[PDB]
Design an enzyme around this catalytic site. Structure first.
Site, PDB file in Angstrom:
ATOM      1  CG  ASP A   1      43.933 -42.245  64.352  1.00 53.47           C
ATOM      2  OD1 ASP A   1      45.138 -42.541  64.409  1.00 53.47           O
ATOM      3  OD2 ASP A   1      43.239 -42.545  63.351  1.00 53.47           O
TER       4      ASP A   1
ATOM      5  CG  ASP B   1      49.119 -43.628  63.552  1.00 59.80           C
ATOM      6  OD1 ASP B   1      48.219 -43.083  64.231  1.00 59.80           O
ATOM      7  OD2 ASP B   1      48.878 -44.463  62.652  1.00 59.80           O
TER       8      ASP B   1
HETATM    9  C1  LIG Z   1      43.777 -40.976  56.585  1.00 56.35           C
HETATM   10  C2  LIG Z   1      43.405 -42.410  56.213  1.00 56.35           C
HETATM   11  C3  LIG Z   1      44.350 -42.948  55.152  1.00 56.35           C
HETATM   12  C4  LIG Z   1      43.430 -43.350  57.433  1.00 56.35           C
HETATM   13  O1  LIG Z   1      42.159 -43.152  57.954  1.00 56.35           O
HETATM   14  C5  LIG Z   1      41.717 -43.987  58.941  1.00 56.35           C
HETATM   15  C6  LIG Z   1      40.333 -44.198  58.997  1.00 56.35           C
HETATM   16  C7  LIG Z   1      39.796 -45.012  59.991  1.00 56.35           C
HETATM   17  C8  LIG Z   1      40.624 -45.604  60.930  1.00 56.35           C
HETATM   18  C9  LIG Z   1      42.016 -45.403  60.892  1.00 56.35           C
HETATM   19  C10 LIG Z   1      42.560 -44.580  59.893  1.00 56.35           C
HETATM   20  C11 LIG Z   1      42.938 -46.068  61.936  1.00 56.35           C
HETATM   21  C12 LIG Z   1      43.992 -46.998  61.309  1.00 56.35           C
HETATM   22  O2  LIG Z   1      45.280 -46.434  61.740  1.00 56.35           O
HETATM   23  C13 LIG Z   1      45.052 -45.222  62.333  1.00 56.35           C
HETATM   24  N1  LIG Z   1      46.039 -44.388  62.689  1.00 56.35           N
HETATM   25  N2  LIG Z   1      43.763 -44.952  62.514  1.00 56.35           N
HETATM   26  C14 LIG Z   1      42.118 -46.852  62.992  1.00 56.35           C
HETATM   27  C15 LIG Z   1      42.769 -47.468  64.068  1.00 56.35           C
HETATM   28  C16 LIG Z   1      42.047 -48.171  65.041  1.00 56.35           C
HETATM   29  C17 LIG Z   1      42.733 -48.793  66.100  1.00 56.35           C
HETATM   30  C18 LIG Z   1      43.760 -48.150  66.795  1.00 56.35           C
HETATM   31  N3  LIG Z   1      44.406 -48.792  67.759  1.00 56.35           N
HETATM   32  C19 LIG Z   1      44.080 -50.028  68.098  1.00 56.35           C
HETATM   33  N4  LIG Z   1      43.107 -50.681  67.466  1.00 56.35           N
HETATM   34  C20 LIG Z   1      42.437 -50.104  66.475  1.00 56.35           C
HETATM   35  C21 LIG Z   1      40.657 -48.270  64.927  1.00 56.35           C
HETATM   36  C22 LIG Z   1      39.997 -47.646  63.852  1.00 56.35           C
HETATM   37  C23 LIG Z   1      40.720 -46.947  62.884  1.00 56.35           C
HETATM   38  O3  LIG Z   1      40.013 -46.382  61.853  1.00 56.35           O
END
Ligand SMILES: CC(C)COc1ccc2c(c1)[C@]1(COC(N)=N1)c1cc(-c3cncnc3)ccc1O2
Length: 369
Positions: free
Chosen positions: A34, A220
């Site tokens: 991620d 992303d």
């Molecule tokens: C820095 C802050 C504002 C954002 O933080 C987060 C925290 C948790 C988080 C995610 C982000 C997320 C949602 O989008 C992204 N890029 N990661 C994220 C994306 C997925 C995901 C990714 N791809 C397909 N399905 C699910 C699964 C979990 C997930 O969790």
């Protein structure tokens, strides 16, 4: 870097994961890659969706930081207990580092029912780490503790099983063709970039370029769709509607609220336009463009989902963009490189492209403040 090739797996729409080990003796987990977050966080309790989870009681090298972390995000939340441990990547560089690990102890809508991953690897910068920027992200720890160069690159290949490559510490030239073109990382928090121009079938949207980056544009791997600011989404859909007048579609479809179907094998790619994003280049008044096909933005669920959606958090270049390209996160030089992916899916007419240079004025005005 051959040993790192094909080290990513996944299922359509459920993200890309890499194998990792945590603790001594090593515990193997699959971890979502991620570039849109900055925490290393793993399941640590027997949630029914999990194949496995981190058992801190089995690790001699575990250290408790005696601190909690609470992380809501737009589509769910997780909560956990901070610690450090030895972490390595079996199909990555031959090293082991001591990294921060959040042991996930409560979550909602975070784990996916049916998925094969158990944790998340946030590759972005400390500024957006939780609870605050003193929690050193994994990649910073890796670079600080080893001789691994400060960059990684991603080849996301798509199709159901998906596959790809995360090259840690370098660039594998067999994963792309043509030249890399670099756009500056505007600020080190998200992987933030500036879009200076948008075309649909070579036709300029003609919007003030500030709209393209309101309130940010990011790269992303943890987002499936190309997400566009509301005003820009609206304008893009109007143009794509026009360009594909051969057939008629429901308003719900453009909102990603119902599929549209073609009798298998007769999907008309040709009626659908290419989309180009011009990115701020390395030199004053210089840009380059990246171009994707409908093969990238019409996702198979023959039925298809429109995978461009509106956003209130700015432009998000997710998998729909990244699957066309080999993407170099050149942290050392504060830039992101794009080249045509050697694995991307194309027909015999059109092809995803990275082209430059172009002359683009006032590119500094495209960023939002
Ligand atoms: C820095 C802050 C504002 C954002 O933080 C987060 C925290 C948790 C988080 C995610 C982000 C997320 C949602 O989008 C992204 N890029 N990661 C994220 C994306 C997925 C995901 C990714 N791809 C397909 N399905 C699910 C699964 C979990 C997930 O969790």
């Amino acid at each position: 870097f051959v040993e790192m090739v094909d080290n990513l797996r996944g299922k359509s729409g459920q993200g890309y994961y890499v194998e990792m080990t945590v603790g001594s003796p090593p515990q193997t987990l699959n971890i979502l890659v991620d570039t849109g977050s900055s925490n290393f966080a793993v399941g640590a309790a027997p949630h029914p969706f999990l194949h496995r989870y981190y058992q801190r009681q089995l690790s001699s090298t575990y250290r408790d930081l005696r601190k909690g972390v609470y992380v809501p995000y737009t589509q769910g939340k997780w909560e956990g207990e901070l610690g450090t441990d030895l972490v390595s990547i079996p199909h990555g560089p031959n090293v082991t580092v001591r990294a921060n690990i959040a042991a996930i102890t409560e979550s909602d809508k975070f784990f996916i029912n049916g998925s094969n991953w158990e944790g998340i690897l946030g590759l972005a910068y400390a500024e957006i780490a939780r609870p605050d920027d003193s929690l050193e992200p994994f990649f910073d720890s890796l670079v600080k503790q080893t001789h691994v160069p400060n960059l990684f690159s991603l080849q996301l290949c798509g199709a159901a099983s998906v596959g790809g490559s995360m090259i840690i510490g370098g660039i594998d030239h067999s994963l792309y063709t043509g030249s890399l073109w670099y756009t500056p990382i505007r600020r080190e928090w998200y992987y933030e970039v500036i879009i200076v121009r948008v075309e649909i079938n070579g036709q300029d949207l003609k919007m003030d370029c500030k709209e393209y980056n309101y309130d940010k544009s990011i790269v992303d791997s943890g987002t499936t769709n190309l997400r566009l600011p509301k005003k820009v989404f609206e304008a893009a859909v109007k143009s794509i509607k026009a360009a594909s007048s051969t057939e008629k579609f429901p308003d719900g479809f453009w909102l990603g609220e119902q599929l549209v179907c073609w009798q298998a094998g007769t999907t008309p790619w040709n009626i659908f336009p290419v989309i180009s994003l011009y990115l701020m280049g390395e030199v004053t008044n210089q840009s380059f463009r990246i171009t994707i096909l409908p093969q990238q933005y019409l996702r198979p669920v023959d039925c298809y989902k429109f995978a461009i959606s509106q956003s209130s958090t700015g432009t998000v270049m997710g998998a729909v963009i990244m699957e066309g390209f080999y993407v170099v996160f050149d942290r050392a030089r504060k830039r992101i490189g794009f080249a045509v992916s050697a694995c991307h899916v194309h027909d015999e007419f059109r092809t995803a492209a990275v082209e430059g240079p172009f002359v683009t004025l006032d590119m500094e005005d495209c960023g939002y403040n």
